[PDB]
Nucleic acid binder design. Structure first.
Ligand SMILES: Nc1ncnc2c1ncn2[C@@H]1O[C@H](COP(=O)(O)OP(=O)(O)NP(=O)(O)O)[C@@H](O)[C@H]1O
Ligand SMILES: Nc1ncnc2c1ncn2[C@@H]1O[C@H](COP(=O)(O)OP(=O)(O)NP(=O)(O)O)[C@@H](O)[C@H]1O
Ligand SMILES: [Mg+2]
Ligand SMILES: [Mg+2]
Lengths: 457, 457, 171
DNA sequence: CCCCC
């Protein structure tokens, strides 16, 4: 009774082909879920699975025509969709899934339950996923060189560890991180170590995702981040020189959301799932077009302060205040990392840090005090208090301080506000910021401002 | 004779395949109407419906080639189009349709009468659609935190509810709503809750639909809005720092019409039905290039004024006038909502609000007062009116007031008009607006304005 | 179909524009709610578009199309309250214009006395509220069609210029 | 379609 339909029915009963909500067909081959939009892999699954069927059914699947017929039947059978990539604490490899909470490695049907449609791209080797090894010792020395274990670097080192370990989580993070340092401090070394450790879950993009409009037309540079767990942007075009495009704060806000809008070439899929830790490597501090409390909530900075130099340039490097430590450059490290020598040692370190910093919830917090741009605003937040009903009685002496009440609200005229605020910031140094604050928060009635200096109280 | 033609005739008689006005082919599979432009579903329907046909006819449908022949017959037989999505009070699910007027869930042929070709994408559960539940108390607490039940917030809160309930109606709305507030006020929480509640009827788009030419070319960002009952745009590139493209009033007007123009890749359907409540998440009020009563009549604003902060930054949050209340941030809420914990509780709340605000006709009303960009024009309503032929005798005092009789109609000079305007408002903060108004109302005979102030009478 | 005032102040070729393209075989077009020209500082009425739009063909790219020529059958009527002052006055606009005069006043009883004294309004009547309700019912559909057919038969055909009807065409 | 413009 239509042998080929029966074969398709059995293959469907195995649950090895699924239809996803984006319209892709994912197949379970070699202990991983795979898909290829440009070329479906269903006939590959049919050929591979021919060994699990009766003897008479297997001999039909050696003809490509019959495999195509079975594929047509399977495509007509799949009507409903499924959801994929819903477990944030599972690390998919090419031959199984690693449980980050437990540490157990699963294969076969154990790994199949988590419909992880992405993977590192390499096989998990449990012989190399060990704590004691010469590779581990070399990597420990390298890491302690890049981020020393001193008391002045404790917070910075902890933030470094937490940011690197968050690249294993399949969830949406609320902060973008800047690896900030001078030249030859180990930022690219860390980037390449992470890329080696996490394989295909890592991606590099261009700066257009920070300075251009994401929707526009086709944009693979934003559609390629779909389901990635780490996104790297490098070589910030510093903006001290005139004409440089600033970073769009709305781009930051859009990149911090669970879904990002953008499509590739020849595609109608306009929304991409955002699971990525976004890191920007820079020698210069960022400059944004507009500054507000929404942006100051999504920025963290890690600093690199160890210089690796040739013997000729060491002495001068010792007289630079951008460095706290000067070491000798090792010319064989780049090739060693390019060969994936520290892949599993760094993976073990990342898993250990994930355990360490995953008190029930792992959350990335901002560091607004590390950005000079924000400085002014922070200082303002420590100087002024919004006028409230509790300040009405204080008017008794507020008049002696220059305060004039109006509509039951304490206010200070523009001239008085300028006189009082010139005592905290240099007019030339903080001209644009002070003017912007005045314009943004100035009232009218002759201009008024609803703020009281904490010192007067 | 011609068994396959007879099978196609029977399938056509079942009424499970229809041709829409745009030319879509909609099929009825698994208790829902479905269409996939770039992936026809007629052969899936043939395979699924083979069971209703006689015994001899069903065995022929196991061959993909025979199914393709039957599909060719069926689509040659379909000459007349039908009307779809004409009931705005039916909510379609993956297994039936819910009546919003009464609250009865239909399945099978009962749901088939309403040709609802879109659905939430998930199955309606009767057990979880309950008024009392542990999740309902948490949802009520969250919603009350975001929009407190206080007199000062009464009216605003209602608008909130109304807008949210309007996401259930399958009709065209005449307003665009702006969710306005400072950072960490619950706007994105509300958006995620609504997305969870209404599934696939919710869509997210880019800001291009607000600041670009809708015609252009193949536009998936507009083609994806077809038959959607909720469209969200986020992160307006505000204009505090001037230099960004403004919102086009032409797009605002095109987005309130029953039909929109936009076509996907590899498809020819430039016509999309507009059922969507359009909501914009912003930290800054909008600014448009042109202001006119046509644009001023389709804008509404909802305020968010509750701050959720960590204990470290709470005290400062208590001295900001942008917040009426400060709460404690919960780090588990995001993951709870992302896992669809409050899907059915929020659906029940939305249905209750729909019943409450759907007295015979539900309508969305603009709130032009909130927008400051519209402020000056509004003052013109109380500033001056257009003189009629009834202001002849008044000129007896008009000469005393400054106006000079001319053409038997009250009129004012340019300098006199400027002097009179100076009384209502100061040109220091509105001088450019005064100049624009003078140019707009300029009349030349040596230019005079035939406008009468209300106070003048 | 009705058209706005954008066409009278914008170029045709430009980029993606559906308004001009949808004119294909469309049998009428009215520019309504005109941007009164008395507003100094606003762009004046362009005459190049007036001359071009009357051509037997229409040049312009329909959205998501690849043809820049379309049939032009629409009858062009521009309805406004203010006099037209062309941006540039030449022989083309002088010989390619006309004017229709309306002097019927629909005024409410409250404002009838004030409205009647207006010189512009010659006959003043009481506004009929239900007429709009009768318009949407399409009750005057066949009657209007019959009247239009009668007028077309009686008048048949062309449109003569009215240089005197426009003040700016005086000098 | 994208590119191109
Ligand atoms: N212990 C060490 N750890 C890391 N890198 C080391 C170490 N010893 C030597 N190096 C090398 O010193 C150089 C450090 O610069 P590298 O990390 O490549 O770039 P960067 O300083 O991050 N970026 P840039 O400023 O643009 O040059 C590389 O050649 C490293 O391989
Ligand atoms: N009761 C509560 N109601 C709403 N959000 C809450 C509540 N308790 C904690 N939160 C959290 O507080 C945070 C507020 O952020 P969010 O909901 O995105 O606000 P927002 O106003 O959209 N922020 P922003 O884009 O910066 O202006 C989120 O982590 C919420 O989950
Ligand atoms: Mg480098
Ligand atoms: Mg938000």
């Amino acid at each position: 009774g239509n042998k080929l339909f029966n074969i398709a029915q059995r293959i469907l009963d195995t649950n090895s082909v699924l239809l996803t909500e984006r319209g892709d067909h994912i197949v379970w081959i070699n202990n991983s879920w795979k898909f290829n939009s440009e070329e479906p892999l269903i006939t590959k699954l049919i050929l591979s699975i021919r060994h699990q069927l009766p003897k008479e059914y297997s001999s039909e699947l050696l003809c490509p025509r019959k495999r195509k017929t079975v594929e047509a039947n399977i495509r007509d059978m799949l009507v409903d969709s499924v959801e994929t990539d819903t477990y944030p604490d599972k690390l998919p490899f090419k031959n199984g899934v690693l449980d980050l909470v437990d540490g157990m490695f699963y294969s076969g049907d154990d790994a199949k339950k988590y419909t992880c449609t992405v993977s590192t791209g390499f096989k998990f080797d449990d012989t190399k996923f060990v704590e004691d090894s010469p590779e581990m010792e070399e990597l420990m020395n390298i890491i302690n060189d890049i981020q020393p274990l001193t008391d002045e670097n404790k917070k910075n080192r902890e933030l470094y560890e937490k940011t690197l370990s968050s690249c294993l989580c399949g969830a949406t993070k609320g902060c973008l991180t800047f690896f900030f340092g001078e030249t030859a401090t180990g930022k690219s070394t860390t980037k390449r170590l992470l890329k080696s450790a996490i394989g295909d879950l890592f991606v590099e993009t261009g700066q257009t995702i920070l300075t251009d409009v994401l929707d526009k037309g086709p944009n693979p540079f934003i559609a390629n981040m779909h389901l990635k767990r780490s996104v790297f942007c490098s070589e910030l075009p510093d903006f001290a020189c005139s004409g440089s495009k600033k970073i769009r704060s709305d781009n930051i806000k859009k990149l911090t959301e669970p879904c990002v809008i953008g499509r590739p070439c020849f595609s109608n899929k306009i929304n991409n799932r955002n699971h990525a830790t976004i890191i920007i490597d820079t020698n210069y501090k960022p400059v944004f077009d507009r500054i507000d409390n929404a942006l100051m909530r999504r920025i963290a900075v890690v600093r690199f302060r160890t210089h690796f130099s040739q013997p000729s340039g060491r002495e001068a490097a010792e007289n630079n205040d951008a460095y706290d430590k000067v070491k000798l450059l090792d010319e064989g490290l780049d090739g060693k990392i390019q060969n994936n020598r520290y892949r599993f040692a760094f993976l073990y370190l990342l898993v250990k840090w994930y355990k360490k910093y995953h008190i029930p919830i792992m959350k990335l917090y901002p560091t607004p005090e590390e950005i000079p741009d924000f400085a002014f605003y922070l200082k303002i937040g420590t100087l002024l208090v919004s006028s409230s009903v509790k300040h009405i009685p204080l008017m008794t002496d507020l008049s002696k301080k220059g305060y004039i009440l109006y509509d039951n609200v304490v206010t200070l005229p523009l001239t008085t506000f300028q006189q009082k605020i010139s005592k905290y910031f240099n007019s030339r140094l903080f001209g644009h910021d002070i003017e912007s604050f005045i314009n943004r928060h100035k009232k009218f009635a002759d201009e008024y401002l609803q703020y009281i200096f904490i010192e007067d109280i």
